[PDB]
Amino acid sequence: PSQNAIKRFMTLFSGREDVFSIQYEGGYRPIRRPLNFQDIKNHFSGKKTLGIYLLKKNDTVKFAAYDIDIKKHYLNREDKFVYEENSKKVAKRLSRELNLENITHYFEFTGNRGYHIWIFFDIPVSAYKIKYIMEKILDRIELEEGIDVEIFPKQTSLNGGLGNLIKVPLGVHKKTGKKCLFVDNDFNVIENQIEFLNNIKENKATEINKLFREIFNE
DNA sequence: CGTGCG
DNA sequence: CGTGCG
Ligand SMILES: [Co+2]
Ligand SMILES: [Co+2]
Numbered sequence: 476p477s478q479n480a481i482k483r484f485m486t487l488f489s490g491r492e493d494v495f496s497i498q499y500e501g502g503y504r505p506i507r508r509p510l511n512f513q514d515i516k517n518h519f520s521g522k523k524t525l526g527i528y529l530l531k532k533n534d535t536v537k538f539a540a541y542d543i544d545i546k547k548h549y550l551n552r553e554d555k556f557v558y559e560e561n562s563k564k565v566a567k568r569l570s571r572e573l574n575l576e577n578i579t580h581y582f583e584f585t586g587n588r589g590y591h592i593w594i595f596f597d598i599p600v601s602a603y604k605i606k607y608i609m610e611k612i613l614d615r616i617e618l619e620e621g622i623d624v625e626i627f628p629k630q631t632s633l634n635g636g637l638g639n640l641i642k643v644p645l646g647v648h649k650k651t652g653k654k655c656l657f658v659d660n661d662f663n664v665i666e667n668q669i670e671f672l673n674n675i676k677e678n679k680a681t682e683i684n685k686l687f688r689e690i691f692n693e
Numbered sequence: 694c695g696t697g698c699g
Numbered sequence: 700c701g702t703g704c705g
Contacts (some may be wrong), residue, residue: 496694496705503705504694526705528695542705627705629697637695640705 480669481515487595487675488643489537491528496640498524498649503640521647521654529628530638535599539609540641541569542625544589549621559588561619563662566590568616569624570660576612576686579676582662586648586655590662591641597677603631604687611690645672 476484495510496503503526506514510525517523529536543566545558552558566582569592573580583591594605609626618624629639642648644655645668657665657672665671 498705499694502694502703544704547703625697625704629705639696640694642705 476516476519476669478512480672481512483672484515484643484645485510485512487538487672487677488527489531490640491531491637494528494637496526496528498526498642500649505637518643518646524642524646524649526640526642528637528640530602530630530633531599532633533599534602534632536602536605536628537596537599539594539596539605540627541566541592541609541613542585542589542627542641543569543592544585544623544625546621546623547588550588558619558621562589562622564619565616565622565624566592566662569613572612572615576608577678577682578608578612578686579678581671581675582658582660583644584656584658584662584664585642586646586653587651590658591644593644593675595675595677596680596683598680600680600683601631602628605683606631608683608687608690 493509494505494507496505518525543562545562549558578594581593585591606626606628613624627641647654657668659665
């Protein structure tokens with residue numbers, strides 16, 4: 476991947492400035508130094524899979540994500556594929572309401588058992604405003620059986636910690652060995668992932684701020 | 694590992 | 700409180 480592609484990835488998925496994490500066999504662990512270009516290349520090649528601490532040190536985030544998963548209890552069933560489709564359904568319902576609010580967002584298959592819905596901002600926004608917005612919008616949709624949705628950021632203040640992390644796309648899931656790629660509104664894998672990454676549109680912080688004031692003051 | 698969520 | 704999840 477070009478230097479430009481790496482610079483664009485590091486700009487969209489920009490979280491804690493001086494700590495990241497990588498997936499090991501027993502889970503994720505913090506790497507206590509800034510993310511560098513070689514780390515991205517190790518992610519893109521499948522050698523080391525990255526996870527990003529969304530919460531920056533001033534309790535702001537530059538991106539956010541819904542995490543839509545099939546419950547692990549349902550993976551053993553012969554109708555497992557019904558719950559894959561149900562997870563697409565939940566994703567489509569979130570996507571429509573997000574678009575009603577003019578929150579531009581993007582789909583990614585996670586490499587395991589669900590989808591991320593990625594939301595990017597032009598400059599970082601206060602974590603509690605976007606967590607509040609995402610929870611309100613999520614409460615508006617109907618969940619399908621066997622499907623769980625989590626929101627990142629999982630917290631809105633660090634209180635001296637790191638917060639929770641999210642696996643970022645264009646790598647491999649270390650538990651399955653499967654790539655995690657962007658998909659289109661039909662959930663088909665996109666052929667040119669880098670060019671899709673360049674065309675990703677960031678929402679405006681001033682817009683997010685207004686939308687929070689409107690919903691909060693109801 | 695850090696810490697949320699049942 | 701135990702311990703999955705990223
Ligand atoms: Co997930
Ligand atoms: Co999840």
